[PDB]
Design an enzyme around this catalytic site. Structure first.
Site: not given
Ligand code: UWP
Length: 274
Positions: A13-15, A18-21, A132
């Protein structure tokens, strides 16, 4: 409590640094029919990062608000601790607004702005400083709701002080956060002004705060620029009162920045008038 065996990796989902979701299916029944969740994890085995991650998890767990992502629990494999939270199907506001800029009007932008203010005011009541505040850390629940989605840099104010000194998203930082590492509700308000700018430029890459500040020019150059009242420009088609709100959030004097209660009052008014 969540079982690692029942947590099925679906997608990245995200990066962060130092972490990733990740998106995961949580299914005790074992047939992929349970609940989809979002899972935060650390990149590597570290102690300084892990200590910060445990503090972040307790910060999120302590928060219960309509405009704050819902904490669900923790998942142990001790190390390697995973944070389980609700999955918001529309993802980040930064990406959502970049994708649907043609469909989102000023009333909608002001609706999202108001909700960010409400979420921030609630952080204030807990003496939490986000540090942030950016559209990349705001998630879209549905067409009518956004939530602050990450608390990785969030600090708790000392009992007797209105600021926290911690030794970085520099293009979102207030001058005192750049020069003295001082973080407060007022520096979260400065960052909010930058969020308001981000929203009214529809995440146009060429108009992003790093793009704009770098053209006006690094931390040393930014400090001098802000001291000489160099600021982000008025976005194309900006309503007058929204540009005045941005300008006031970006006051060099901490004591002259608006409060989150007042920003919510002012934004709700501008939205109702249109
Ligand atoms: C279709 N679709 C849904 C999603 C989706 C759903 N959710 N539900 C909860 C969290 C997310 C996220 C998401 C994406 N980036 N993030 C962060 C920035 C913030 N809020 C936290 N992360 C910080 C680190 F953990 F990576 F370090 C980056 C969170 N993306 C992506 N594509």
């Amino acid at each position: 409590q969540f079982e690692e065996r029942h947590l099925k990796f679906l997608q990245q989902l995200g990066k962060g640094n130092f972490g990733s979701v990740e998106m995961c299916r949580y299914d005790p029944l074992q047939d992929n029919t349970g609940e989809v969740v979002a899972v935060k994890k650390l990149q590597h085995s570290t102690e300084e990062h892990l200590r910060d991650f445990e503090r972040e998890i307790e910060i999120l767990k302590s928060l219960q608000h309509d405009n704050i992502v819902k904490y669900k629990g923790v998942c142990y494999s001790r190390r390697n601790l995973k944070l389980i939270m609700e999955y918001l199907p529309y993802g980040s506001l930064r990406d959502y607004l970049q994708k649907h800029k043609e469909r989102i009007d000023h009333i909608k932008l002001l609706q999202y702005t108001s909700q960010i203010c409400k979420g921030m005011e609630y952080l204030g009541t807990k003496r939490y400083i986000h540090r942030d505040l950016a559209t990349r850390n705001i998630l879209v629940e549905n067409e009518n709701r956004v939530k602050i989605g990450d608390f990785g840099l969030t600090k708790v104010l000392p009992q007797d002080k209105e600021y926290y000194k911690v030794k970085s998203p520099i293009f979102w930082y207030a001058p005192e956060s750049l020069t003295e590492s001082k973080f407060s509700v007022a520096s979260d308000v400065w960052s909010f002004g930058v969020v308001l700018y981000e929203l009214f430029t529809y995440i146009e890459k060429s108009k992003s705060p790093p793009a704009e500040f770098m053209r006006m020019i690094i931390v040393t150059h930014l400090i001098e620029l802000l001291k000489n009242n160099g600021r982000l420009p008025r976005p194309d088609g900006c309503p007058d009162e929204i540009y005045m709100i941005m300008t006031e959030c970006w006051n060099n004097n901490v004591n002259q920045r608006p409060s989150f209660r007042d920003l919510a009052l002012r934004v709700d008014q501008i939205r109702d008038n249109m």
